[PDB]
């Protein structure tokens, strides 16, 4: 059987990650080691040199020295290697985006042993990036060439976007209205294991996590905002702007930063089709195909550090995170500090914000019941290892399932 390695990097607003996969004739995956995926990261992310383009392709070279010592020297000028920026490169503006993408391009052709393809490096649509992760969590799951009804939804939560993508019927698929503004179409339609699929699948720019925090900042400017802590005072620097921000001498506020959440979302937007989420965004139907939802990235990274979300992933309810607000809005800086310990120093000031505007997303945002049941996850258990829940498996099955011989497990 003829074998292929995939080297897939994501470059995220906040962070680099390298992926490497290998795989046999039919699309199942190979072990590297006794593991199915080596990984590897690097902060801050390319967006963050958008003024030094040169040297964003240079923070890449650590990850892309690790990736080509785990795949076979022998294996390297016919093993793919891509590149996908998403959100952070999506919100700068423009030239800045290309220029960074192409120093990488020149450095992955100058200094990559591997193959380079004219498409390797680029900044992928929303609409893709939901998909590949919908790709990505459904062939983990083996939900993959089953009717529509019985495959998995996903909502991706990274820094600067999200993206819900769902499985949907001919039917809602052939009376899709016409995308508003300035955005993209609701679908997509791709072929996965000789089925044919119609996802729908929609990216919210600036509805990130931490573009959501910033969001939520602007509204109180001048002022103390209700959503941090008591004790708390800093300069908080994101997508090339300063912010002054602070928590309220009298503390944080549940309500108050509720209010907020749902404030920045634009619920009461006018929506050209119904139903809608919020913007005036239409919601896709959220039939059968997304009963079931893997919910990922950072109602991931936090849950789980304050321990009510457990690795690799675990059951929960979206009312996990109202009362994980709850609490983190109910306590000082200070005490933060010491009931939280496992959270990440310069991601502790933002625990009342983070999971509040999470649980507003969620239900307020897509309409989930609070009571039902999700999935929060940073990997699937596949076979005897952990394999990530992200979007690059989705872009490493595109990319393989083309080479020549080999089975065609998805495309389009
Ligand atoms: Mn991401």
Not at 41 to 46: A, C, N
Not at 209 to 226: E, L, Q
């Amino acid at each position: 059987l003829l074998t292929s390695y995939a080297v897939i990097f994501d470059a995220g607003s906040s962070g680099s990650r390298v992926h490497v996969f290998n795989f046999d004739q039919n699309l199942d995956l190979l072990h590297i080691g006794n593991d199915l995926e080596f990984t590897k990261k690097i902060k801050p992310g390319l967006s963050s040199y958008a003024d030094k383009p040169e040297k964003a392709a240079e923070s890449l070279i650590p990850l892309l020295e690790e990736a080509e010592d785990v795949v076979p020297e022998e294996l390297h000028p016919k093993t793919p290697l891509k590149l996908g920026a998403t959100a952070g490169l999506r919100l700068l503006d423009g030239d800045a985006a290309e220029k960074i993408l192409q120093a990488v391009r020149e450095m992955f052709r100058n200094r990559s042993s591997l193959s380079v393809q004219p498409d390797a490096v680029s900044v992928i649509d929303g609409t893709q990036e939901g998909s590949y992760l919908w790709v990505t969590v459904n062939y983990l799951l083996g939900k993959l060439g089953k009717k529509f009804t019985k495959t998995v939804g996903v909502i991706d939560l990274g820094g600067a976007s999200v993206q819900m993508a769902y499985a949907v019927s001919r039917n809602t698929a052939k009376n899709a209205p016409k995308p508003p503004q300035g955005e993209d179409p609701y679908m997509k339609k791709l072929v996965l294991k000789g089925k044919k699929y119609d996802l729908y699948v929609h990216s919210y720019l600036r509805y990130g996590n931490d573009a959501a925090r910033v969001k939520i900042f602007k509204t109180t400017d001048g002022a103390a905002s209700p959503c941090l802590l008591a004790g708390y005072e800093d300069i908080y620097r994101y997508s090339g702007e300063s912010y002054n921000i602070y928590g309220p001498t009298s503390g944080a506020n549940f309500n108050e930063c509720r209010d907020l959440a749902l404030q920045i979302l634009r619920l009461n937007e006018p929506c050209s089709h119904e139903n809608c989420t919020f913007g005036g965004i239409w919601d896709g139907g959220k039939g059968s195909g997304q009963k079931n939802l893997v919910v990922t990235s950072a109602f991931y990274y936090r849950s789980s550090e304050v321990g009510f979300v457990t690795p690799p992933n675990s059951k929960n309810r979206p009312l996990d995170f109202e009362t994980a607000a709850k609490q983190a809005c109910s306590l000082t800086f200070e005490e933060a500090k010491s009931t939280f310990p496992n959270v990440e120093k310069d991601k502790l000031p933002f625990v009342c914000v983070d999971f509040t505007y999470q649980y507003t997303l969620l239900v307020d945002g897509f309409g989930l019941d609070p009571e039902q049941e999700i999935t929060v996850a940073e990997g699937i258990e596949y076979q005897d290892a952990i394999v990530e829940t992200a979007w690059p498996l989705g872009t490493a099955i595109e990319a393989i399932s083309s080479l020549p011989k080999f089975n065609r497990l998805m495309y389009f």
